[PDB]
Ligand binder design. Structure first.
Ligand SMILES: Nc1nc2c(ncn2[C@@H]2O[C@H](COP(=O)(O)CP(=O)(O)OP(=O)(O)O)[C@@H](O)[C@H]2O)c(=O)[nH]1
Ligand SMILES: Nc1nc2c(ncn2[C@@H]2O[C@H](COP(=O)(O)CP(=O)(O)OP(=O)(O)O)[C@@H](O)[C@H]2O)c(=O)[nH]1
Ligand SMILES: Nc1nc2c(ncn2[C@@H]2O[C@H](COP(=O)(O)OP(=O)(O)OP(=O)(O)O)[C@@H](O)[C@H]2O)c(=O)[nH]1
Ligand SMILES: Nc1nc2c(ncn2[C@@H]2O[C@H](COP(=O)(O)OP(=O)(O)OP(=O)(O)O)[C@@H](O)[C@H]2O)c(=O)[nH]1
Lengths: 427, 426, 426, 427
């Protein structure tokens, strides 16, 4: 059992630098490249007393790549795997897909082929990017389309950072997100999502960090993506694999948008005063403001829900906790899936980074759940897109790259097709 | 003499199967390394009924562990009794089923089912005279219900005359650790109702319900749940593993418990179930055990028997005891509760006893019941399947492996039929 | 008494021949220097059947190493048992054949074949009464197939009455370490089918296939492959090297296995083949050995016997054992699988046993089978030859030594004939 | 078993100086001339505690010869064996063949006779030259013709450096290559080829040497030509000889042009991070850009393929690797040779030079394979020759030496005969 990953954009490599430092300290891998069947999923055996991750950080702009080469984690990652481009995507879906995308996929696509040939138990793929930019939108759809036609049957765990409702980093991110989702709607099996102001709200209230940064945001994100793959690494009472995320969460092949959340988030001084059990954290993850997306779950209905625990959590009190969620009428489940619960447990507990913002806890939980609540966000993104599309704003840059007005209409109607599917399935 | 071929399918089947070899190894007095260190000579009298003799007085078990996930075998092999099993029997795939009945039955199981049939054929021809098959699986998931039910069909084709025994755990709505349970459940009972001669319906919530009231464990794990259900696996095959005053083979249990070819879904139970803080305040005499056996809350299924009528019941006792107190307890237990027993059968109880009780207990028994209350489980399982099937939810993944939606309807046709069959005799 | 003249031709023949003297030297208890340090007196009873007596109680082997490449003899002479061989027997050329049948048969072999005939004549007249010739070669290459098959023709001219035994490894399409294999293969079988009385068809890919499943070596070398095939060379000549309850000489094996003069290409096998991590979990009794002998995957040829029918089979057991369990296993193995055995022969099995097993093992046997499934190898070898011959590819090098293209066609005529001969009796 | 070699031109002696320093450090031969049956193939026994190579460096221009005499390796090579001329060939096929060639072959041809008489196991010959020049074109065809009529039956392993498609050192190299190939097409048994920009591409991508020189290029070439003859020097599990290159690679006597490649090429810092096994390098040598010639193997079909490994390589994983190449449809083999694989293995591992660009590796591989892909290069060389031949460019120098217009027509049609043979055999 093994799995490979590729990181795209500033959002990907910043999570890439933050997640692989977490994976190395879990398995006792020192940052100099060296220290049985626990690290074989992500890390390889480089002859004798040396390891290499199964990672390929790709990015067109070279500032992030050489910083990793001149960073602290020099000897861990392969120097050849750290791919760098020549010219930035420049916040354009077309530029990272046709001009700069086509001339760099050929080094990239053949690399993941031979990097998979040395492996034998490749379960699937997981990517890290953000559709708010150019390289995260154009190049990501290109490679994911280029490998889906080759492999197809293997899974694809997308991790995209969508823009917030009112907070935003760019101005043309509806154009970047609406075009790349036209290709991602059919090829991606599942895609977990993260938001900007929502994750700031997590560390503001519970973790009381009044001045956080992206370095702190990626740590708890690393706890999420490391905890979902913690079942295949360490032994568990109920082992789950990456293929469970396709069967239990995707009721229809074109409705493949779960939410993401995590608990308990608690500081050092607050950890010793707050009680740690499954009952209080089971209510915390279902709390609406404790999610990683500004979206009201009370408005919609949960299509499916998955739970994955860590640490010394016995199966008694965790089953009594979810039974209290079923009779709690604050949230409402859809009639099309009454038994929409997938429980998981791993024995290895949540770790802690030296000097990190999160505290050590003897148990944790991460919930991924499909719901019809995210239709209003697509309505919001589609609504604001019509305001700029009516004035033809920021269009001359895309057609200057090689595109036209036609596929903008395809990107509009394809999201319009998604809304009528979300209101139909939500009946 | 009347060997039983064990086959551990699925994750849960490997766990309870691993616990099954653990609990009986203490009864026979077998070391985890494989050598004998018991005390009684009768342990060697019927050690060949489950084990095979080898050099150096070592006894390897006749276990065939099958699973589509290699991490499960690493946990079973690294267990306390993991080293006694044969390395050749550890056949397994690499890619898991991901809780899909179609994957483990058509594509992921079909590549491995050619590999397991040659292994079980070795254990079948190597024995003197095989009796049946003692299988463990779970109706949930893909590898347990898909691949486990597949080889039941193939073994029925090769050995149509032998007994096909299954200790199958099944889901419930109160405790459900998987979204695709009713689809996997309704597809599995289509094969169990036609092929297998006998099946034990074990509900997971009742494993938790029994540990609160009677055993009152404050920190129960899955290993504690495996201990009580594995004791029932030892109780059903006690008569041929040790001598007794009234022996009842697994075939002798089948004819008394299976009045019709489809009505063979049983309801197991076990006693004494008493905590350490209340062991001294209990008498080991049989009337205190008999009232616990037929108790509505003692069994490991959530179906309340008072809402129906018992079709037929069997109780296999263990330990040296008096037969008059044993037999007379079966009289007053049924006549005082005649409403909960069918009037078109004069005697629903089947008796059996052994002279060699478990280690650490002087008196014990196992409760085996075929009751019409089990249709309540088929009711709620059918409604969960019909609720998700009526809009074709979670079916597009099954169609990827070439599975047709009519087979789900054919499985639905079998569900209401066996439900109405139990309703005929109530 | 019934001496056997060994002759190691080709690179691979020298390797397995060197391993052949190694494995039997431990059975007879011979030091690498040449002195005896055994324990049993029966080792000296039939030490002359392969060795020659000398001064100081030293026993030199009757081995004749022939090769057209002097580097091979340096590796064999510098081996563990390299010093025991006679220096005079190390006859060899200087220039290699370069994987060309014409060079080692017409020009490069003809200059040396005058030198080897005077050497084998010395070992033949020095013995009391010669029985046959135990030769090792490879159908690939030029020195093994060209020069090795040449002296088979000359020995047939001089000794037409003696037995001509050959342990010949042959190529396959899945594992092919040489481009000129089918040309060298089809030219070699033209001589083996006419002159030799018996031949063992060993496929190189099956040597790798058997080491994964049963032996599960994680780092196998060529020496490990030589060990299992050399055990078969010891099994065929066990009856005359040690006493037994039912002795079968090499001529006694020939009449039972060679029903027609051309159908003498056999399929060897050996058991027990068990890893060190699974030796304790296996019983050395004969029914577990018999099912391994007739197993489709146990043999060292890739041809599946279930796709055809066995013409005739022989099993030479070793070690003190009970004959009833031995003989009765030959009954149920053939009648239960009557589709895989010809109906125009009442009994296809030949039995033999010895009282002196190998060192370190108490029970063992060797499987020798002449089956019609071997035509699948002749099918794929013929298609590879016809695919390259139909446009005269790689033939201009052969014509340089004066070889005619009609001989390739005559070799092709023999190929489809023996293929159709096996198809007649299926 | 022994073999002799002669080096012609600047290309030969630069490889001659680079390859014999590799052969001396393998057998522990110090450069002062002194330190059992391993060095007897190439080096002789000069009485007691002294050796001499079986080499004769011939060249018309004297700058390379006396530099070797005044070089560091003075005592190794014989002072008489280092033959020097009087006047340079001057980039002319005719001048190094008739005027300057005829007056210097008489010292050279009788030397290889008596230098072979002291030997007894002469397997064949191997030469080193480049047809882009004059002495590498004219004098090489003269001596190879002069010894082929004498010996004939012995092998000839030609190692010529052809010009690149667009990169080139001279201007008249089509005239030099087209004339000398007219004589080499019939007398040479086999001829391995090397290119200029292709080998630069090897050290650019994998070895990351952005400023290499010819000294670095000849090192990895020495690894190739030393690894093919490593079977006869050291003991191996499957020993192969020089006559295998004639039988397994030459399907027809006039189609005798294999390719050349080598793997793994990896730097020092990259060797410790990259995993070393047969699976990854078996895919690397079949990679099209990892060859020593700018030529697409996907366009053609491999007529035959030969493999030779070194080091601790067991025969299990190497056979599984080539089996994956058979089912891989990225490359296509010709129907005239389905079982076109010749595998070899030697126990002695790849060495490393002190201060060299290549790193130490526990295993290696070198693939020589005949293919119909090289017909386009002959079409390219023949195409550009017609442009200059139509204008009669650079012709007055050749006819000033003694030739005429007729044999230029023979050189043109003889290569035209080769193209119709390459398209016929490629069916
Ligand atoms: N009484 C016990 N129940 C268990 C145990 N482990 C799991 N389970 C229960 O059985 C349910 C499903 O059984 P499994 O864990 O075997 C799922 P399976 O291995 O068959 O499929 P995959 O793991 O996806 O390949 C599961 O949701 C639990 O409710 C256990 O150790 N003891
Ligand atoms: N089971 C074994 N097979 C071997 C061994 N050595 C080689 N071979 C196999 O036999 C094949 C050909 O046999 P040889 O190595 O003897 C080639 P030969 O010496 O007869 O001709 P030349 O070496 O060209 O003079 C060869 O390609 C291997 O597949 C070995 O040690 N053990
Ligand atoms: N949460 C989080 N988001 C990030 C981080 N880094 C970048 N992002 C997201 O990335 C988005 C910008 O798109 P990018 O693909 O990174 O654009 P870029 O990398 O600057 O390259 P160009 O698009 O060519 O300008 C922002 O809206 C952020 O939300 C990070 O470290 N943490
Ligand atoms: N790869 C490589 N090629 C070389 C080297 N030295 C010379 N060459 C090749 O030799 C070609 C020139 O032909 P030469 O025979 O060397 O010409 P020359 O030695 O200068 O003598 P003249 O032809 O008379 O001028 C160039 O195109 C090079 O490609 C070398 O060290 N390495």
């Amino acid at each position: 059992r093994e799995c490979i990953s590729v990181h795209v954009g500033q959002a990907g490599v910043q999570m890439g630098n933050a997640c692989w430092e977490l994976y190395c300290l879990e398995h006792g891998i020192q940052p100099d490249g060296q220290m049985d069947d626990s690290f074989t999923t992500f890390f390889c055996e480089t002859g004798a007393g040396k390891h290499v991750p199964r990672a390929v950080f790709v990015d067109l702009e070279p500032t992030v790549i050489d910083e990793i080469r001149n960073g602290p984690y020099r000897q861990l990652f392969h120097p050849e795997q750290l791919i760098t481009g020549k010219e930035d995507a420049a916040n354009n879906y077309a530029r990272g897909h046709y001009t700069i995308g086509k001339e760099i996929i050929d080094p990239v696509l053949d690399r993941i082929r031979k990097l998979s040939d040395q492996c034998t138990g490749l379960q699937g793929f997981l990517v890290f990017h953000s559709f708010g930019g150019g390289t995260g939108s154009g190049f990501t759809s290109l490679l994911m389309e280029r490998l889906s036609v080759d492999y197809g049957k293997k899974s694809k765990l997308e991790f995209s950072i969508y823009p917030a409702p009112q907070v935003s980093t760019a101005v043309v991110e509806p154009y970047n997100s609406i075009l790349t989702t036209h290709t991602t709607l059919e090829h991606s099996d599942c895609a977990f999502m993260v938001d900007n102001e929502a994750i700031y709200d997590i560390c503001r209230r519970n973790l009381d960090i009044e001045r956080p940064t992206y370095t702190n945001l990626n740590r708890l994100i690393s706890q999420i993506v490391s905890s979902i793959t913690a079942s295949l690494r360490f032994d568990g009472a109920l082992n789950v694999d990456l293929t469970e995320f396709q069967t239990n969460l995707v009721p229809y092949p074109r409705i493949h948008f779960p939410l993401a959340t995590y608990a308990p988030v608690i500081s050092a001084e607050k950890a010793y005063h707050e009680q740690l059990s499954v009952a209080e954290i089971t209510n915390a993850c279902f709390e609406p403001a404790n999610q990683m997306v500004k979206c009201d779950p009370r408005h919609g209905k949960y299509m499916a829900c998955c739970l994955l625990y860590r640490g010394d959590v016995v199966p008694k009190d965790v089953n009594a906790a979810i039974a209290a969620i079923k009779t709690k009428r604050s949230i409402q489940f859809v009639d099309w899936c009454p038994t929409g619960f997938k429980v998981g447990i791993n024995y290895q507990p949540p770790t802690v980074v030296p000097g990190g913002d999160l505290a050590k806890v003897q148990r944790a939980v991460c919930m991924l759940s499909n719901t019809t609540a995210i239709a209003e966000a697509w309505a919001r993104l589609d609504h604001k897109f019509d305001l700029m599309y009516a004035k033809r704003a920021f269009v001359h840059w895309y057609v200057g790259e090689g595109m036209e007005e036609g596929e903008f209409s395809e990107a509009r109607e394809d999201m319009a097709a998604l809304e009528k599917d979300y209101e139909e399935v939500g009946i | 003499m009347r060997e039983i071929v064990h086959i551990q399918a699925g994750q849960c089947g490997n766990q309870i199967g691993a616990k099954f070899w653990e609990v009986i190894s203490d009864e026979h007095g077998i070391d985890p390394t494989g050598s004998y260190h018991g005390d009684s000579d009768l342990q060697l009298e019927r050690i060949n009924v489950y084990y095979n003799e080898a050099a150096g007085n070592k006894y390897v078990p006749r276990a065939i562990l099958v699973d589509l996930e290699p991490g499960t075998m690493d946990s079973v092999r690294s267990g306390p009794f993991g080293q006694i099993f044969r390395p050749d029997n550890f056949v397994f795939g690499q890619s898991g089923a991901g809780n899909n009945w179609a994957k483990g039955h058509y594509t992921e199981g079909a590549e491995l089912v050619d590999s397991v049939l040659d292994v079980v054929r070795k254990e079948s021809e190597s024995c003197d005279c095989l009796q049946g098959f003692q299988l463990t699986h779970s109706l949930g998931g893909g590898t347990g219900s898909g691949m486990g039910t597949l080889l039941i069909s193939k073994i029925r084709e090769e050995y149509p005359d032998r007994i096909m025994n299954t200790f199958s755990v099944m889901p419930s709505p109160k405790v459900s650790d998987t979204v695709v349970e009713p689809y996997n459940a309704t597809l599995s009972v289509h094969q169990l109702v036609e092929n297998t001669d006998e099946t034990y319906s074990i509900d997971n919530e009742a494993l938790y319900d029994i540990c609160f009231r009677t055993l009152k464990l404050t920190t129960p794990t899955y290993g504690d749940l495996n201990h009580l259900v594995s004791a029932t696996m030892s109780g059903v095959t006690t008569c041929l593993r040790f001598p007794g005053q009234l022996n009842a083979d697994l075939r002798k249990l089948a004819v008394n418990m299976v009045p019709f070819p489809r009505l063979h879904f049983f309801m197991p139970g076990f006693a004494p179930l008493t905590s350490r803080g209340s062991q001294q305040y209990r008498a080991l005499t049989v009337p205190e055990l008999t009232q616990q056996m037929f108790d509505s809350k003692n069994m490991m299924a959530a179906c309340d028997p008072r809402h129906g009528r018992y079709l037929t019941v069997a109780a296999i006792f263990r330990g040296r005891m008096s037969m008059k107190e044993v037999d007379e307890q079966m009289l007053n237990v049924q006549n005082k509760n005649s409403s909960y027993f069918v009037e078109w059968i004069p005697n629903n109880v089947k008796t059996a006893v052994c002279d060699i009780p478990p280690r650490g207990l002087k008196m014990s028994a196992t409760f085996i019941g075929n009751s019409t209350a089990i249709q309540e489980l088929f009711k709620r399982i059918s409604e969960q399947f019909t609720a998700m099937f009526r809009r074709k939810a979670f079916l597009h993944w099954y169609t990827g492996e070439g599975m047709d939606e009519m087979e789900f309807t054919e499985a639905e046709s079998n569900m209401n039929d066996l439900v109405s069959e139990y309703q005929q005799y109530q």
